[PDB]
Design a protein around this ligand. Structure first.
Ligand SMILES: *[C@@H](C)[C@H]1/C(=C/c2[nH]c(/C=C3N=C(/C=C4\NC(=O)C(CC)=C4C)C(C)=C\3CCC(=O)O)c(CCC(=O)O)c2C)NC(=O)[C@@H]1C
Ligand SMILES: *[C@H](C)[C@H]1/C(=C/c2[nH]c(/C=C3N=C(/C=C4\NC(=O)C(CC)=C4C)C(C)=C\3CCC(=O)O)c(CCC(=O)O)c2C)NC(=O)[C@@H]1C
Ligand SMILES: *[C@H](C)[C@H]1/C(=C/c2[nH]c(/C=C3N=C(/C=C4\NC(=O)C(CC)=C4C)C(C)=C\3CCC(=O)O)c(CCC(=O)O)c2C)NC(=O)[C@@H]1C
Ligand SMILES: *[C@H](C)[C@H]1/C(=C/c2[nH]c(/C=C3N=C(/C=C4\NC(=O)C(CC)=C4C)C(C)=C\3CCC(=O)O)c(CCC(=O)O)c2C)NC(=O)[C@@H]1C
Ligand SMILES: *[C@H](C)[C@H]1/C(=C/c2[nH]c(/C=C3N=C(/C=C4\NC(=O)C(CC)=C4C)C(C)=C\3CCC(=O)O)c(CCC(=O)O)c2C)NC(=O)[C@@H]1C
Ligand SMILES: *[C@H](C)[C@H]1/C(=C/c2[nH]c(/C=C3N=C(/C=C4\NC(=O)C(CC)=C4C)C(C)=C\3CCC(=O)O)c(CCC(=O)O)c2C)NC(=O)[C@@H]1C
Ligand SMILES: *[C@H](C)[C@H]1/C(=C/c2[nH]c(/C=C3N=C(/C=C4\NC(=O)C(CC)=C4C)C(C)=C\3CCC(=O)O)c(CCC(=O)O)c2C)NC(=O)[C@@H]1C
Ligand SMILES: *[C@H](C)[C@H]1/C(=C/c2[nH]c(/C=C3N=C(/C=C4\NC(=O)C(CC)=C4C)C(C)=C\3CCC(=O)O)c(CCC(=O)O)c2C)NC(=O)[C@@H]1C
Ligand SMILES: CCC1=C(C)/C(=C/C2=NC(=C\c3[nH]c(/C=C4\NC(=O)C(C)=C4CC)c(C)c3CCC(=O)O)/C(CCC(=O)O)=C2C)NC1=O
Ligand SMILES: [Cl-]
Lengths: 593, 67, 159, 156, 156, 160, 161, 156
């Protein structure tokens, strides 16, 4: 019903362990973990003995812990479901304490507990904190409290009680930046679960290494990677103006954007629209929110160049609202702020490091074609549509230059195909038919040029079928089936091909027309997947469409194409779409009356 | 190119910064001429008191050669 | 996602405390963690020398460094070196995590499309990464080299 | 090439090429025959240029991997020298150092530092090759070639 | 000018004048005699250039404020024509259209719309002045002048 | 701004064309252009060598270089030779342009304040600039060395 | 930023020798206060909201600077003041752990007074607030560690005066 | 130092130093005595370390400016060696190469190229200092000082 922006694989972080946080920090700094991060990992793995045995004893005595766990409530007055949820919550809290102990971080507790004050009905919060305190007392009662890790269990229970005592924490807000931009809200649990992103702020009195760290993060934001090791980052005047008391991080972002390094990376190999999307990534930390934002950017580039677009992005209200003056732009993804569903696919394909690997501009295609009806496309995306030439299964690769526009067609949806029957005439399409073009030999050759769009070598000749048809033992339909069951046909159209692409190209060669919808394509794919290649060839030759169109004594021929096929078959444009205006009069040349 | 040395303090009136979103507001910044109009308008839109605007680079009355 | 995250994810998805087999898997991770960390440190101090030796033994004096090859045109050579450093450091990240999730989320997704769009040979990349596995094996020891070659082999799996 | 940067400078500000840039194009287009002659000269005497440059380079520095007794390393040094004077000829033909930059000086230090070869050794060999091109070329051609030689010297 | 643009192009990649920039500088300095000859010719005959251009522009486009019967408007149009040909003289002296751009042809549309003058009428007049500049100049002189005249045309 | 640009600005302020005196100034610049281009080639040829010799002859083996001094630590020596290369390249630009306006717009403004803010010693800096003037005067000769050393004295006064 | 060890190294590096016996003795003092500095940081981190609560209660509430026309009036400005107080506490924690007030001089006191004078924040009011926060850390930490953190809170006040 | 980097990592994300960071703190504090012992050991025998490093480095790489006959250059090279072993002891004291990076391995290549001494010669000399520090220090001690030695190898 509507075109798809892509559903990429996302892994939302529910919490942080100790190793995940350290690796997140080292990764977000683009470096090997250093000696203190090394000491983090090694010290936590050293305490792992005590942590695992704490979790062992707590899981072993969980039944008695939650059995032991203000005005005590009545079972009958509270309700059976509410009593069940009280016991479930209590066992759940103990489980998450053991989870935190093994993970070495209270991030799971703090994320999953801090905003629970009113989720639990808040008239039983005194009962809740008394029960949690009694669980703390009992867990320490059978875990000896002199100087052991019972201090650790006390601290983790205290952190759980402290998180639960925190009242209503305000949801974070990604406010709409324009009339076309929707505002979004964001729970603080989702904010605290999200991966910590370093906020590189450059102040004039920072030490040199901290400044160089901020410069390196600026390179990683803008140029997508660290270029400082290379001699291409020779920008000694911008760096030097940036380091001391002047030329702040915003001016430096602009200087990085207008540099020819940025043009070589993200403007020279791209058309304007893809370049605009990448600039949105590199200067605001987010993709295009809406079509109208892209209209503003595209018109601005059209009359003033791309450097003015960089100037407008870093001079925008949103830039000063998020990154201010001396904060490096950072990527605003899943847990950093609230995400919109509008650009979910394009923006998650843009935040990925393989965003320059795509040339076709993902945002504008999705945003425009959502406000348009369904496109003329094979039901399993446009990569399944081969190139309408005489021969050769030429499909768009999913990896090499991904130009993918996924679209959901219904099962009953049918493709519009441009037939050659209504077009042209008769005795114009009966020159490409080759029934029984009366010589047998010509019919063998034309059956080849249908089955393999060009004449084949002698090793690819199916000479036994030639002798059979010259003797009248088999008819044209059986010969075409034998050619389509030859080994070289399998190599040409079945082995080195995606299976539904293989089925579609065999359908185009054996039927002379693309498939219509998921009925046909689903049936062929199911046949060739549960039964195989020769079964699909037999089912396509014995298909009722083959019998109605090509019968038994007629070589298959192309009958229908995609409209893209005719657009390829008219590079000068179509014949007569509206009467031309040869020798016209325009104002200005007329006004000089 | 002719530069503006601008000191301004731009306050936030629409958002509460939690602990990290707080950056700074009192910035002294070299501003290019071709953007200073838009930066003045932007920091007037957000509500900043502009206390110091001087011409860091270039002279006054330049008919040519100012960029 | 480290090994602790994947283990607690399974346990919380089935809704129980950490089971004895799960605790045993955590035990193997936690008491192999010291050799993992040591391997991480010496992989950090000798990453440049490893990349040098691996380019020397796998990617040099083949016709991909020659004219018309993929490691002609010195910036492409530097990009090749940087890709090797990324693979080394992210295999290190996975080794410290105990899980290949950092690989699946930051390297192997995005890599095949990028390499096929740029025209980078996948086979030369996998032979370079397996040379990396051999070099880290030789300079580390059989156990640490196997534990990091598991993640180098995960990277080669995604290629 | 120089005309590539002329077109890219007309681009990125969304304007047509100015007649000043068109004048740069005219001047390069008439110096083209001289540049083609210089490139033919380099493709002619590249062999003796690499021979004499390696001779004087080993004379001024014997502490290089190129003369450590391993003849494969001397073959690789000879081939690097020949490739670089080929790139300088490309730069002459294109009228700009951007072929030379984008083939042999962008990731120059990372490649040669991976190859365990001193940077200033390559720089001094480039100085020797520059002096050989000075020795074999006419004065304007000598200046044009030695300028891109100096560009490589700066890259190291 | 050509010198300032060459320096800021050298400034951008924080480097010295490249093998092409000095060459363009030498071309500019050696064509300087011709440029000074063009400037002297234009400054000598600006009066008759403006008169003949206004003659052709009123024979061609008469529905203009230039010839709406007010002598102040006509005198302003003649002064503007002399100013623009003086700016073209500045452009040929500087080797680049930046004296024309930074003075005449950046805020041209907004300004001349504010004056309520039709822009295409000014384009017609600049075409007239360009044709008369052909009428008085030699082939290279008139080509270099028509360069900046069509800059003025594009700005309108 | 360059010599031609300053001449255009002056005659645009006065509103007229370039008179015969300004045409003499412009012919002076246009006949100095060839030797200025040769000197620009020479400075681009040996810039690192010039910086090497000047740091050796003016800044080394004084206690400014050793501990507690301003060119102590590797990064500050790199910053100092970076500043020396800055001064050399910008004096070369001013020599090409015939005017020190590029030094007054990009080099001299703010630099004294920044050097006093960082504790950079201005006196040894100006010594290094005039030692650079001496080395360029030595390796190019009197005339081109005089032209570039005039802008070196302009930088020396701007720091002063 | 610079810590106590980093400053010891920096003076000894500007002098040109290894750490003499006095510099190493200052290092002994720092390395033997490290345990209590870590414990004080744990306590300050755990009770940050409570410290800001009692601090704003004992210096800023119930006076006309929170009244109509005041600075902590119009709730978003009060929450701005809460954020400033929490920021000051966390940076005093960083200063206490490092052993040096260099981080405050680089990231807190650099331009803060001019900023507040541009926003109209009463400088004396937030200085009294920082001294009240010093008193709260004194009361709930002890005399010794409380005095230690009070040194860097005094540095905040002096850089604000 | 390690303390500074702990504080900076707790910064830039506006959080308190985590319990694990304070574990690092309270352990690096318990690492202190061996660090003082190393700094005292490296300071106590520094003269003999630089003498024996010079001995082996002049044995292995004689094509250096240190043994060109100028005792001023020799004394300056010994001063550089003593300074670098001082910085490595400083890095033991701090617990990380931050004093080492900031004082001696940030602008290392640019400075020694301004001083024209070959970079690999400095690398060979520091390798000699590294193996004498292996000779004079016990195994754990050899590890903690050879770490920052390997850092100096990376920078050169
Ligand atoms: C109950 C509704 C179901 C449910 C919900 C659920 N959603 C998410 C995460 C997100 N939800 C959105 C949604 C929107 N963004 C928009 O712009 C719009 C229109 C205004 C919508 C509806 C988004 C973008 C996310 C991503 C996170 C974010 O906040 O930006 C989650 C969390 C996913 C996770 O595991 O992290 C959940 C739980 N879950 C159920 O079981 C119900 C069926
Ligand atoms: C004019 C000949 C025909 C026509 C044009 C038309 N185009 C759009 C909208 C867009 N066109 C583009 C094009 C490009 N993107 C690039 O990067 C490049 C630079 C080389 C080009 C040419 C884009 C991205 C858009 C969208 C942004 C924009 O609207 O400006 C429209 C408007 C479509 C709409 O729904 O608003 C139109 C009308 N239409 C015709 O009928 C002509 C035959
Ligand atoms: C020969 C001068 C160059 C060359 C050719 C080459 N071509 C192929 C493979 C194919 N060529 C085609 C071409 C067409 N299909 C058509 O319908 C028409 C007219 C529109 C043409 C020209 C196709 C479709 C294929 C693939 C299927 C087939 O081989 O029949 C190859 C083989 C490459 C491979 O890996 O298969 C080659 C080598 N190669 C050169 O070096 C010459 C410059
Ligand atoms: C080297 C051994 C092999 C090789 C490499 C090669 N890669 C590129 C270009 C890129 N490589 C990447 C990949 C990544 N970037 C990252 O940040 C990550 C880690 C998270 C990865 C995996 C990217 C994005 C690029 C694009 C441009 C860039 O340089 O960053 C090249 C250059 C390709 C080109 O034509 O530009 C090369 C040469 N090629 C081989 O042949 C080796 C087997
Ligand atoms: C000679 C002046 C110096 C020298 C040379 C030397 N080079 C190598 C090996 C290689 N050199 C390159 C160079 C390039 N490949 C490119 O694509 C480009 C752009 C044109 C360049 C410059 C490469 C890639 C290699 C590796 C071999 C290969 O092609 O696969 C060596 C050998 C090093 C080794 O360890 O084997 C040497 C010795 N040595 C000197 O001493 C001179 C200063
Ligand atoms: C060397 C001759 C003297 C010296 C130098 C020194 N300079 C700095 C730091 C800076 N130098 C500048 C200057 C410029 N930046 C520019 O962009 C321009 C080009 C027009 C100039 C002239 C600036 C702004 C700084 C600060 C920022 C930066 O790092 O570049 C230092 C470092 C000081 C410190 O503590 O960081 C030094 C050592 N020192 C001497 O003793 C010589 C006399
Ligand atoms: C509270 C103790 C006192 C108080 C506070 C108050 N502050 C503001 C506004 C801001 N506070 C800051 C502070 C910082 N930014 C930084 O980067 C750092 C380190 C240098 C600090 C400490 C900033 C930048 C602002 C403005 C933007 C923002 O709010 O984030 C206000 C608002 C004033 C106004 O809106 O004009 C207030 C009320 N006021 C008191 O009376 C208390 C004594
Ligand atoms: C010795 C291992 C190598 C070597 C050295 C050598 N150095 C100099 C001169 C200087 N060395 C320095 C170095 C530093 N100053 C710093 O602040 C830092 C950080 C601690 C360093 C590394 C400096 C500044 C000088 C200049 C003069 C001085 O003594 O301060 C020389 C003399 C250079 C000359 O010829 O003028 C030499 C020879 N030479 C070798 O062969 C070894 C590989
Ligand atoms: C107009 C925005 C604004 C508000 C709403 C505001 C709140 C405020 N009320 C305040 C306080 C209280 N509000 C209350 C109010 C309630 N007591 C309750 O339990 C309930 C249900 C309320 C409804 C708000 C009480 C008891 C106090 C005592 C002060 C304290 O406990 O610290 C103060 C203290 C300072 C002062 O009064 O001068 C402040 C700052 N001040 C402001 O600037
Ligand atoms: Cl813990």
């Amino acid at each position: 019903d509507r075109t798809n922006g892509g559903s990429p694989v996302v892994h939302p972080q529910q919490y942080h362990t100790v190793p995940t946080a350290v690796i997140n920090g080292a990764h977000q700094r683009d470096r090997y973990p250093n000696h203190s991060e090394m000491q983090t990992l090694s010290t936590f793995l050293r305490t792992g003995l005590q942590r695992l045995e704490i979790a062992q004893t707590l899981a072993q005595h969980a039944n008695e812990i939650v059995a032991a766990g203000f005005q005590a409530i009545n079972i009958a007055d509270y309700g059976a479901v509410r009593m069940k949820r009280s016991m479930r919550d209590l066992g759940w809290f103990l489980r998450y304490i053991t989870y935190a102990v093994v993970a070495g971080d209270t991030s799971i507790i703090t994320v999953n507990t801090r905003g629970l004050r009113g989720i639990i009905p808040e008239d039983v919060t005194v009962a809740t904190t008394v029960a949690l305190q009694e669980m703390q007392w009992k867990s320490l009662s059978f875990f000896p409290v002199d100087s052991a890790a019972a201090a650790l269990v006390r601290r983790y229970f205290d952190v759980l009680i402290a998180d639960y005592q925190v009242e209503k924490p305000s949801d974070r807000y990604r406010t709409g930046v324009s009339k076309h931009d929707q505002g979004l809200s964001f729970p603080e649990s989702y904010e605290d679960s999200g991966c910590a992103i370093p906020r590189w702020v450059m102040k004039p009195t920072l030490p040199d290494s901290e400044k160089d760290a901020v410069i390196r993060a600026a390179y990683r934001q803008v140029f997508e990677r660290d270029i400082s090791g290379l001699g291409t980052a020779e920008l000694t005047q911008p760096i030097s103006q940036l380091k001391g008391e002047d030329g702040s991080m915003e001016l430096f972002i602009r200087q990085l954007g207008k540099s020819r390094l940025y043009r070589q990376l993200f403007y020279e190999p791209y058309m304007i629209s893809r370049s605009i999307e990448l600039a949105c990534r590199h200067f605001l930390g987010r993709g295009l929110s809406c079509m109208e934002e892209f209209q503003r950017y595209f018109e601005l580039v059209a009359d003033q160049g791309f450097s003015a677009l960089v100037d407008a992005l870093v001079s925008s209200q949103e830039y000063a609202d998020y990154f201010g003056a001396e904060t490096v732009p950072y990527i605003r993804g899943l847990g950093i702020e609230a995400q919109a569903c509008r650009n979910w696919g394009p923006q998650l394909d843009l935040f990925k490091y393989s965003a320059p690997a795509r040339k076709v501009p993902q945002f504008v295609t999705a945003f425009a074609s959502y406000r348009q009806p369904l496109p003329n496309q094979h039901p399993y995306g446009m990569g399944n549509d081969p190139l309408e030439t005489q021969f050769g299964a030429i499909f768009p690769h999913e990896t090499t230059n991904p130009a993918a526009q996924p679209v959901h067609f219904s099962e009953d949806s049918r493709r519009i195909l441009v037939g050659h029957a209504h077009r042209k005439s008769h005795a114009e399409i009966s020159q490409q038919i080759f029934s029984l073009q009366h010589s047998v030999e010509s019919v063998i050759l034309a059956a080849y040029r249908q089955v393999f769009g060009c004449e084949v070598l002698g090793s690819q000749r199916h000479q036994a079928a030639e002798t059979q048809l010259k003797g009248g033992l088999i008819t044209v339909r059986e010969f075409v089936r034998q050619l389509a069951k030859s080994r070289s046909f399998r190599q040409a159209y079945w082995e080195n091909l995606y299976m539904t692409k293989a089925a579609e190209i065999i359908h185009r060669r054996l039927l002379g027309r693309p498939t219509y919808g998921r009925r046909e394509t689903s049936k062929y794919y199911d046949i060739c997947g549960r039964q195989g290649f020769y079964a699909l060839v037999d089912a396509l030759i014995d298909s009722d469409d083959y019998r109605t169109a090509f019968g038994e004594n007629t070589v298959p021929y192309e009958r229908y194409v995609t409209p893209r096929g005719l657009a390829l078959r008219s590079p000068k444009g179509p014949v007569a779409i509206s009467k031309l205006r040869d020798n016209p009069h325009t104002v200005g040349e007329y006004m000089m009356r | 190119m002719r530069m503006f040395r601008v000191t301004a303090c731009v306050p936030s009136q629409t958002r509460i910064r939690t602990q990290r979103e707080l950056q700074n507001t009192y910035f002294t910044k070299l501003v290019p001429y071709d953007n200073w109009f838009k930066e003045q308008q932007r920091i007037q839109k957000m509500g900043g008191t502009i206390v110091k605007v001087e011409l860091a680079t270039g002279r006054r009355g330049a008919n040519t050669g100012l960029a | 996602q480290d090994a602790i995250t994947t283990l607690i994810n399974t346990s919380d998805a089935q809704g129980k405390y950490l089971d004895d087999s799960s605790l045993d898997t955590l035990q193997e991770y936690f008491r192999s963690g010291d050799l993992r960390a040591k391997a991480a440190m010496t992989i950090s101090a000798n990453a440049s020398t490893i990349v040098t030796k691996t380019v020397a033994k796998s990617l040099l004096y083949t016709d991909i460094t020659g004219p018309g090859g993929n490691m002609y045109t010195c910036r492409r050579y530097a990009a090749c070196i940087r890709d090797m450093d990324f693979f080394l450091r992210y295999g290190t990240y996975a080794m410290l995590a105990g899980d290949a999730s950092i690989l699946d989320e930051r390297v192997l997704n995005g890599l095949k499309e990028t390499y096929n769009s740029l025209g980078v040979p996948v086979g030369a990349t996998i032979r370079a990464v397996q040379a990396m596995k051999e070099v880290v094996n030789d300079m580390l020891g059989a156990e640490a080299g196997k534990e990091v070659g598991y993640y180098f082999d995960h990277i080669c799996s995604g290629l | 090439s120089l005309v590539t940067e002329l077109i890219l400078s007309a681009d990125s500000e969304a304007r047509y090429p100015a007649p000043k840039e068109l004048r740069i194009f005219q001047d390069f287009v008439k110096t083209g025959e001289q540049r083609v002659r210089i490139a033919k000269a380099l493709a002619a005497n590249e062999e003796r240029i690499v021979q004499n440059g390696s001779q004087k380079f080993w004379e001024r520095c014997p502490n290089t991997p190129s003369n450590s007794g391993v003849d494969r390393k001397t073959a690789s040094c000879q081939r690097d020298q020949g490739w670089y004077v080929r790139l300088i000829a490309y730069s002459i033909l294109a009228g700009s150092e951007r072929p030379l930059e984008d083939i042999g000086t962008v990731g120059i230090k990372e490649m040669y530092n991976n190859l365990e070869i001193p940077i200033r050794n390559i720089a001094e060999c480039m100085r020797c090759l520059k002096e050989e091109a000075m020795a074999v070329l006419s004065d304007e051609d000598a200046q044009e070639v030695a300028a891109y030689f100096d560009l490589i010297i700066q890259s190291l």
